[PDB]
Design a protein that fits this description.
Function (chain C): May be involved in floral abscission.
Number of strands of chain C: 0
Number of helices of chain C: 0
Chains: A mainly beta (185), B mainly beta (591), C little secondary structure (12)
Protein name (chain C): Protein IDA-LIKE 3
Helix content of chain B: under 10%
Organism (chain C): Arabidopsis thaliana
Radius of gyration of chain B: 33 Å
Strand content of chain B: 15-25%
Distance between the termini of chain B: 112 Å
LRR repeats (chain B): 44-68, 69-92, 94-116, 118-139, 140-163, 164-188, 190-213, 214-237, 238-261, 263-284, 285-308, 310-332, 333-356, 358-380, 381-404, 406-428, 429-452, 453-476, 478-500, 501-524, 526-547, 548-571
Bound molecules: a molecule of 3 linked components (NAG-NAG-BMA), a molecule of 2 linked components (NAG-NAG), 2-acetamido-2-deoxy-beta-D-glucopyranose
Oligomer: heterotrimer
Subcellular location (chain C): Secreted, Extracellular space
């Protein structure tokens, strides 16, 4: 189906040395029987569990097709390139864990469109630029770690960021804010 | 007369093309005769054949080769040949077979190809040819094979290709053609054996004329937007062996006339909107494969299908099929794949499915199938994938069925199956996913489950399994999901849970588990989801739990005591620790 | 990659 095709696209663009994605047969009617993929009672993907799988390569915008996905777990890998904009089209996403990877470029503004997101762990990456102010508008956000990154600029202290601690924004290139030691100019 | 510079002409070809791997090293200018050169064939010493397949040759089509006067067979298959095909190709007037497959050739097809009278075989597959097919193609004199597969042709489908009488095979598949109807004039192709028109953007009804091709062996009109009732005239294909109409918008009832096809073996009309009962006459034919899946077909599968001794593929899933599977199914046939999933099929399964011993896939999910698993299936070592879920199956599982070696998925979920998992489970080497959820199964998990290191998923939710978890279960490092919820499991978790390094999910909820949470829970690197709710787990929560990054944590309704650690104080752990009396913590409502 | 003319392999 559409969800399985989107995941197979990811298989093609990722490097899988240990063949952890071998179960991902596109000829299967749905991807739920695949290992590392979990589905709801209506056979729609809700989890992709690929943490510490020695995966390299890059993500695809087709991950956006998975409208009922709640948990995207790609942590402790060597995945490179940018986080796609289409990840904002993941309306039901609750956890985005991309930490301990070599992701680069900006944190998409689209991530603010994740109305029900509860966990954002992007730490230990090479992500660059400013922290989008869209993220503050995610009411459900309870966990945020943007540490060990090379981001820059104003650190939001409003909305969901109101409760957040310095450990969330630690070891960054030039973050200015109340949470930071240095003020914003 | 009767002398030529054929070797020189070949040397001109060699100079024209780039040969990095020096494949044309044998071609020695200094040599008198070229007829011992690599890939060069002389039928006197005149060149009749050149084959330079897979030579890593790069450059334009060498039009100088046409000056080879007796050349009849030219293949440049699987090369880096580039540019437009030169119209001066007509100069090769003695050519009978031309293979230019898997080349980077681009642009419009040369109309001059038709001007070669002698051409019998033309293959231009895997090229970037674009535009309309030349009208000259209608005047091919002696061409039997036309292949333009996997090109960029954006034209309509030519009616004039119908006027090539000698043609045996029309292969135009996987081309981005302008949406176009199948020419009725294609019916006048008397000698045609193969019509390969898959992914040709075909629209409209299938012509009645296609029936008049009695030499037709393969009809592939699949992966197109063809609509309308399947033509009854199709039964006129006396020599038809294969009909593929899958992934089309065709509506109507499968014609009874298809039974009249004695040589028919493989029919696929799957992923269509076809309605009505499957014909008895079609099932009477000794079919090799019958796929009618993802249709709006209704009624009972005719029992006549069992008589075929050639049946390895039956995929009729996604239909409203009532009644039961034929008793003799799999007894007289080399059954490999059965998909009757998402149908209303009822009754006991036919017992003799694996009689031939080549059965790999048994898929019967979302049906009303009742009774006990036939004992014969225990003997079926050929099985690799078993899905019996969402039926009304009862009774114990045959001991052998647990131990089938090449089964990787065993799904008995949502049935009424009873009994204890056998120690024969140790023999299931390939098993990666074991799903026994929502059954009436009872007993203690065998220690032989620990034998299955390659096992990745264990789901036994909604079962009556009881007792201490085998210490062997902790040896399953590759396990990524363990769901043991809604069970009577008892006992204490050991320090050996440390070996569950690859575990993503642990669910032990609605169980009678007792004792302290092992402090080795933090050592589980990829644990993201933990449910220990509705248990009798006691003592202080491990501080190692904080080190874990958990998206789901429930320790609710346990006997856990002591102060909640500082991280756990957050309102994100609000409903995580309800119902543990000795838990006193920062959250509003706790203690 | 080049495909062949034969039955579809969609399975559950
Ligand atoms: C697959 O098996 C599941 C378990 O046998 C079954 O699930 C369940 O769904 C029904 C409703 O269809 C629930 O219903 C009732 O029970 C609750 C209390 O638990 C009451 O509040 C309701 O009024 C009602 O009586 C079951 O509780 C629920 N059980 C479980 C364990 O999930 C699925 O429906 C089965 N699916 C198929 C397709 O067969
Ligand atoms: C096309 O020709 C090339 C050689 O020109 C074939 O390729 C190579 O690939 C083989 C199989 O994938 C290897 O076994 C060879 O060692 C390798 N050689 C070189 C020099 O790269 C290629 O497979 C051919 N393709 C087909 C379909 O026959
Ligand atoms: C067709 O392929 C040939 C070989 O790859 C291309 O090129 C040649 O051009 C090169 C510069 O790009 C020269 O360094 C080569 O020596 C030369 N070789 C020959 C035999 O001419 C050629 O440009 C390609 N044409 C297209 C349109 O892609
Ligand atoms: C034209 O299409 C047919 C598809 O039917 C191609 O192939 C078939 O040819 C193969 C050659 O090895 C055989 O192994 C297949 O069994 C046979 N299939 C049928 C159903 O007849 C054929 O090669 C194509 N020709 C070209 C030149 O591309
Ligand atoms: C912090 O982020 C919030 C996010 O909403 C910013 O919000 C204003 O919110 C309203 C909606 O109620 C929007 O219409 C405005 O566009 C937002 N303001 C601006 C300037 O864009 C808020 O401004 C941000 N404040 C700080 C200090 O960073
Ligand atoms: C039809 O085919 C014949 C013989 O191959 C040829 O002479 C004639 O010109 C063709 N007509 C058309 C319209 O292509
Ligand atoms: C296990 O089953 C899979 C899928 O059926 C198959 O590809 C694989 O080769 C099998 N391995 C063994 C050792 O049987
Ligand atoms: C824990 O389980 C109970 C029911 O046993 C449920 O009501 C509660 O909401 C659950 N909490 C979490 C965090 O899942």
């Amino acid at each position: 189906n559409l969800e399985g095709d989107a995941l197979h696209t990811l298989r093609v663009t990722l490097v899988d040395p240990n063949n952890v994605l071998q179960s991902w047969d596109p000829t299967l009617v749905n991807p739920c029987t695949w290992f590392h993929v979990t589905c709801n009672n209506e056979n729609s993907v809700i989890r992709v569990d690929l943490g510490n799988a020695e995966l390299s390569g890059h993500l695809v915008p087709e991950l956006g097709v998975l409208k009922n996905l709640q948990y995207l777990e790609l942590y402790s890998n060597n995945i490179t390139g940018p986080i796609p904009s289409n990840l904002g089209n993941l309306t039901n996403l609750v956890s985005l864990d991309l930490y301990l990877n070599s992701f680069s470029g900006p944190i998409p503004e689209s991530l603010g469109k994740l109305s029900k997101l509860r966990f954002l762990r992007l730490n230990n990456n090479s992500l660059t630029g400013s922290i989008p102010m869209s993220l503050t508008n995610i009411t459900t956000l309870q966990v945020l770690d943007l540490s060990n990154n090379r981001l820059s600029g104003s650190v939001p202290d409003n909305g969901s960021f109101s409760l957040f601690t310095p450990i969330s924004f630690a070891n960054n290139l030039d973050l200015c804010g109340p949470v930071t030691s240095h003020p914003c100019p | 007369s009767m002398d030529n510079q054929d070797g020189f002409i070949l040397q001109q070809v060699k100079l024209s093309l780039d040969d990095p791997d020096s494949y044309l090293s044998s071609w020695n200018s200094n040599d008198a005769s070229p007829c011992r050169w690599s890939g060069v064939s002389c039928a006197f010493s005149s060149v009749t054949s050149v084959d330079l397949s897979s030579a890593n040759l790069a450059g334009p089509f060498p039009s100088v080769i046409c000056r080879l006067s007796n050349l009849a067979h030219l293949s440049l298959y699987n090369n880096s040949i580039n540019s437009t095909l030169p119209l001066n190709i007509a100069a090769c007037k003695s050519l009978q077979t031309l293979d230019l497959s898997q080349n980077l050739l681009t642009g419009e097809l040369p109309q001059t190809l038709a001007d070669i009278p002698t051409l019998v075989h033309l293959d231009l597959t895997g090229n970037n040819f674009s535009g309309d097919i030349p009208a000259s193609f209608g005047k091919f004199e002696n061409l039997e094979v036309l292949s333009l597969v996997y090109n960029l042709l954006d034209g309509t489908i030519p009616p004039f290709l119908g006027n090539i009488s000698t043609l045996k095979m029309l292969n135009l598949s996987y081309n981005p053609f302008s949406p176009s109807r199948i020419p009725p004039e294609f019916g006048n192709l008397t000698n045609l054996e193969v019509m390969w028109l898959t992914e040709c953007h075909l629209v409209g009804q299938i012509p009645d004329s296609l029936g008049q091709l009695s030499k037709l062996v393969d009809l592939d009109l699949a992966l197109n937007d063809l609509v309308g009732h399947i033509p009854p005239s199709l039964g006129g294909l006396t020599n038809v062996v294969q009909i593929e109409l899958y992934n089309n918008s065709l509506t109507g009832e499968i014609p009874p006339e298809l039974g009249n096809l004695k040589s028919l073996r493989l029919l696929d009309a799957s992923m269509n909107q076809l309605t009505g009962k499957i014909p008895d006459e079609l099932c009477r034919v000794p079919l090799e494969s019958l796929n009618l899946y993802e249709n709006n077909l209704e009624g009972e599968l005719p029992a006549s299908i069992a008589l075929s001794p050639n049946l390895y593929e039956i995929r009729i899933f996604g239909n409203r099929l009532t009644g039961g599977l034929p008793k003799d199914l799999g007894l007289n046939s080399p059954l490999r794949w059965l998909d009757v999933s998402e149908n209303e099929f009822s009754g006991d399964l036919p017992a003799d499915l694996c009689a031939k011993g080549e059965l790999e896939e048994l898929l019967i999910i979302h049906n009303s199938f009742s009774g006990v698993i036939p004992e014969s299936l225990a003997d079926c070592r050929s099985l690799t994938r078993i899905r019996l879920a969402y039926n009304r199956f009862s009774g114990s599982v045959p001991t052998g069925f647990w131990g089938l070696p090449h089964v990787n998925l065993l799904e008995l979920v949502n049935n009424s199956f009873s009994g204890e998992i056998s120690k024969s489970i140790g023999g299931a080497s390939n098993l990666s996913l074991l799903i026994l959820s929502n059954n009436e199964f009872t007993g203690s998990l065998p220690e032989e489950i620990g034998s299955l290191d390659n096992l990745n998923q264990l789901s036994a939710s909604g079962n009556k399994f009881s007792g201490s978890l085998p210490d062997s279960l902790m040896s399953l490092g590759e396990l990524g999901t363990l769901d043991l919820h809604g069970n009577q499991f008892s006992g204490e978790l050991t320090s050996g849970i440390k070996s569950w390094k690859k575990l993503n999910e642990l669910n032990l909820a609605d169980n009678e588990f007792t004792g302290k949470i092992p402090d080795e829970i933090g050592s589980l690197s990829v644990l993201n989801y933990l449910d220990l709710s509705g248990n009798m787990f006691s003592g202080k929560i491990p501080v190692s739990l904080q080190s874990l990054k958990l998206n789901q944590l429930n320790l609710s309704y346990n006997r856990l005591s002591g102060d909640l650690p500082p991280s756990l104080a957050k309102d994100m752990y609000k409903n995580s620790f309800i119902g543990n009396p000795g838990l006193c913590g920062d959250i509003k409502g706790l203690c | 990659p080049v495909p062949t003319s034969g039955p579809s392999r969609k399975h559950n």
